[PDB]
Write a protein that binds this ligand. Structure first.
Ligand SMILES: CCCCCCCCCCCCCCCC(=O)OC[C@H](CO[C@@H]1O[C@H](CS(=O)(=O)O)[C@@H](O)[C@H](O)[C@H]1O)OC(=O)CCCCCCCCCCCCCCC
Ligand code: SF4
Lengths: 317, 49, 34, 119, 92
C-alpha cells in the first residue's frame, strides 16, 4: 500500500493508526468514516494522554456497533419526511494521503456512482482531529442531505459532567429522535431516545430556548436530553441578520479536561446524553454531540457544492 | 486600625503581583501596629516573626 | 485576596495561549485539501 | 435596528457572529446583550471591568459602520496612544438612538488577532 | 480541653477565613475541579436580581483601587505642586 508516517493495517476491517510526533494518534477505520479512538497528549507527567471516545465492544462478527465520530449523511427524500433513505451503501476509496511533517496526517475517502460525489477528509494536527465533508452534486434535479457527525465523547462520572459556553441559543428543544438526529447511525449510536422519568422540558416541538441558563448546563436528566441548539427553523432564520448561534465547549468536574467542539459550515449542535438507560452501554459516562445542518432541508443545487467540518480542539496541555 | 483596613481594601483589583504583595504586607503591618497599641506586644513580635 | 492572587496566577489554562483569544499554536495545518 | 456584525477573536477564515440591536445604548451593554465576549480573558469579580471607567481592556476594532458612532472623547485619545486611528474604547461610546437603519461591522478585541491578511 | 472562649474565637476567625476563601474560589477559581458545585453558579446568573445596582458598586470599587487610594494624588496636587510655586515665589 501507500504510507508515509503510519500503517494501513487491518483488524476485522481496514484501519489506520494516524500518528504525529507528539504521541497523539487516531485509529480510523477504512471500511467507513467511523473513527474508533483518539489519544491526544492531555497531561505532561504520565508519558502521554489518554481520554478517548466511548468505543463499545465488538458485537456480531466484526462488531462495528460502536459509534464515536461516524459521519451520518442521508438524503432529504422529496417523497415524504423520510430523511433516512441511505448512507449510500457503496464502496470507499482512499486517495492522496499527505503528511507535510511528522505532526500532521490526513486521509481522504471517496464515494461516488450511486449518490452524488461524496468526499471525506479526516485530519490529525498536533492537538486536534477534524472531520470534513464535500457533497458535490449534479444531475436531474438538485438533491438533498442531512450531513451530521455525532462524536460520542466520553465523560467521567455522569454526576459531575456538564457543558459550558452556550448560554444563549434558541435551543429549539424539538428533537427528531432515534439517532439523536439524522438516522442511519454509524452502525450504532443509540436508539429511540425517550424520557419517562419526570417532567422534561419542551412540548417536543418548541423553541422555548432564549436559553439564559447560566455558565453550566448540568446534563444529567438524560436518555433524551438531546436538542438542536441552532437558530429556530425559519421563524427567525428567514430575514436578514438572523443571529448566528454559537461555538461549543465541554467540561467534566471530576477529571479536569476540556474539549472544544468547533463547527464550520454546519448549522446545529446535538447535545445529547444518556444517563438513564446507561447501565447497558458501559460504566462511567458519555454523550453524543456534534454539528450538522438538518433543521431545514438542504437543497444544494444542480452543479454546486456543500461544506461542513467539525474540529475537536482541547487546548489542555 | 486605619492603615490595616486601608492596605486591605487596596489589594483588591490590583493586577500586579509585586504590587498587590506590597499592599498585603502593609495591611499586615497594620495588625502589628494595632497589637502594639494595647500592651500585649508579646504576641505582636510573634506575628512579626 | 491572598487566595485571589493564587487562584489567578496558578490555576487556569495559561490565558496567553488558550485558543479562544490568541491563535499562536497551530493554524497553518492545511485543512481539507484540493 | 442598528444591525451589527461581529468579527470575533480571530479564527480560521472569519469567525463572524450576527446580532440585531436597537440603537441608543453604549457598545458595552449592547455587546453584553448578544452575549458575545468583549473582556478578553478577564473574569467577573474585579479584574478589568465594571463599565465606563479607567483600565481600558475593551478595544473593539471598527471596520464597517464607523460613521454611525458617537465622536471620540479625550479619555479615548488618552488611553489609546498605541492605537491605529481605527479602533476605540467602546466603554465610553454610544450609538445613536435614531439610527435604527444602520449597518455596522465590528472586529472584537485586537492584540489577539492576525488579520487584515483578509480583504 | 483548650479554653472554650479562645476555641470559639478561633472558630469565628477561621470561619471568616474560610468564607473569604470560598467567595474567592467562587469568583476566580476554575470549574473543572470538584469544589465549584456550579449548580448555584448556574442559578446566581439566572435570577440575579440586583445586577443593575451591584455592578455600580464594582464601578466604584475598582475605580478606587486603580486610583491608588486617592490620598496618593492628594500629595501630588498639594505638596509637589505647592513647593513648585513656593520656589517661584521666593525667586520673584
Ligand atoms: C492623621 C491625619 C494625617 C493628615 C495628613 C498628615 C500628612 C503628614 C505628611 C505629609 C505627606 C508627606 C508625603 C510625602 C510624599 C513625597 O515624599 O513626595 C515626593 C516629592 C518629590 O518632589 C518632586 O519629585 C518629583 C519626582 S516624583 O514625581 O516624585 O517621581 C520631581 O520631578 C520634582 O522636581 C520634585 O519636586 O516631595 C515633594 O515634592 C514635597 C515633599 C513633602 C514636603 C513635606 C514637608 C513637611 C510637611 C510637614 C507637615 C506637618 C503637618 C502638621 C503641622 C503642624
Ligand atoms: S470602562 Fe474601563 S474599566 Fe469600566 S469596563 Fe470598560 S474598561 Fe474596564
Amino acid at each position: 500500500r501507500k504510507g508515509l508516517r503510519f500503517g494501513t493495517d487491518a483488524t476485522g476491517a481496514p484501519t489506520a493508526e494516524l500518528s504525529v510526533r507528539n504521541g497523539s494518534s487516531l485509529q480510523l477505520r477504512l471500511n467507513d468514516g467511523l473513527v474508533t479512538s483518539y489519544r491526544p497528549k492531555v497531561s505532561w507527567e504520565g508519558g502521554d494522554g489518554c481520554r478517548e471516545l466511548l468505543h463499545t465492544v465488538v458485537g456480531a462478527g466484526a462488531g462495528a456497533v460502536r459509534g464515536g465520530v461516524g459521519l451520518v449523511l442521508n438524503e432529504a427524500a422529496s417523497s415524504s419526511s423520510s430523511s433516512s433513505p441511505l448512507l449510500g451503501a457503496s464502496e470507499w476509496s482512499v486517495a492522496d494521503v499527505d503528511s507535510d511533517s511528522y505532526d500532521a496526517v490526513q486521509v481522504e475517502l471517496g464515494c461516488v456512482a450511486s449518490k452524488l460525489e461524496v468526499s471525506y477528509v479526516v485530519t490529525l494536527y498536533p492537538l486536534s482531529m477534524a472531520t470534513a465533508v464535500i457533497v458535490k452534486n449534479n444531475g436531474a434535479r438538485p438533491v438533498e442531505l442531512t450531513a451530521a457527525v455525532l462524536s460520542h465523547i466520553k465523560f467521567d462520572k455522569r454526576r459531575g459532567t456538564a457543558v459550558e459556553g452556550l448560554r444563549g441559543c434558541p435551543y429549539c428543544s424539538h428533537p427528531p429522535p432515534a439517532s439523536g438526529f439524522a438516522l442511519l447511525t454509524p452502525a450504532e449510536a443509540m436508539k429511540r431516545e425517550e424520557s419517562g422519568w419526570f417532567g422534561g422540558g419542551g412540548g417536543e416541538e418548541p423553541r422555548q430556548g432564549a436559553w439564559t441558563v447560566e455558565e453550566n448546563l448540568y446534563t444529567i436528566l438524560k436518555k433524551k436530553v438531546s436538542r438542536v441548539y441552532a437558530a429556530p427553523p425559519e421563524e427567525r432564520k428567514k430575514r436578514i441578520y438572523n443571529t448566528a448561534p454559537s461555538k461549543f465547549t465541554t467540561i467534566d468536574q471530576s477529571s479536569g479536561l476540556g474539549f472544544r467542539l468547533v463547527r464550520m459550515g454546519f448549522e446545529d449542535m446535538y447535545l445529547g446524553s444518556p444517563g438513564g438507560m446507561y447501565d447497558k452501554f458501559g460504566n462511567d459516562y458519555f454523550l453524543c454531540t456534534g454539528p450538522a445542518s438538518i433543521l431545514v432541508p438542504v437543497v444544494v443545487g444542480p452543479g454546486e457544492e456543500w461544506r461542513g467540518a467539525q474540529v475537536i480542539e482541547h487546548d489542555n496541555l | 486600625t486605619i492603615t490595616l483596613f486601608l492596605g486591605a481594601t487596596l489589594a483588591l483589583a490590583q493586577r500586579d503581583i509585586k504590587r498587590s504583595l506590597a499592599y498585603s504586607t502593609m495591611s499586615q503591618l497594620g495588625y502589628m501596629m494595632l497589637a502594639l497599641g494595647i500592651g500585649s506586644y508579646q504576641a505582636a513580635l510573634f506575628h512579626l516573626i | 485576596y491572598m487566595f485571589r492572587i493564587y487562584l489567578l496566577t496558578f490555576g487556569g489554562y495559561l490565558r496567553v495561549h488558550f485558543q479562544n483569544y490568541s491563535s499562536t499554536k497551530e493554524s497553518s495545518l492545511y485543512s481539507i485539501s484540493l | 435596528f442598528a444591525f451589527v456584525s461581529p468579527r470575533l477573536l480571530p479564527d480560521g477564515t472569519p469567525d463572524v457572529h450576527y446580532r440585531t440591536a436597537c440603537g441608543g445604548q453604549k457598545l458595552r451593554d449592547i455587546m453584553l446583550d448578544a452575549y458575545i465576549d468583549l473582556y478578553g480573558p478577564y473574569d467577573k469579580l474585579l479584574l478589568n471591568c465594571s463599565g465606563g471607567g479607567e483600565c481600558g481592556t475593551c478595544i473593539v476594532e471598527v471596520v464597517e459602520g464607523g460613521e454611525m458612532l458617537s465622536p471620540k472623547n479625550e479619555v479615548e485619545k488618552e488611553k489609546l496612544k498605541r492605537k491605529p486611528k481605527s479602533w476605540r474604547l467602546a466603554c465610553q461610546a454610544t450609538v445613536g438612538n435614531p439610527d435604527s437603519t444602520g449597518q455596522m461591522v465590528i472586529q472584537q478585541l485586537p492584540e489577539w488577532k492576525v488579520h487584515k491578511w483578509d480583504k | 480541653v483548650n479554653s472554650y472562649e479562645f476555641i470559639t474565637n478561633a472558630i469565628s476567625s477561621v470561619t471568616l477565613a474560610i468564607f473569604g476563601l470560598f467567595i474567592a474560589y467562587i469568583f476566580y477559581g476554575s470549574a473543572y475541579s470538584f469544589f465549584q458545585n456550579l449548580d448555584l453558579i448556574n442559578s446566581f446568573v439566572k435570577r440575579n436580581p440586583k445586577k443593575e445596582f451591584l455592578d455600580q458598586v464594582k464601578k466604584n470599587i475598582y475605580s478606587w483601587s486603580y486610583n491608588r487610594g486617592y490620598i496618593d494624588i492628594f500629595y501630588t496636587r498639594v505638596f509637589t505642586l505647592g513647593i513648585r510655586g513656593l520656589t517661584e515665589l521666593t525667586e520673584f
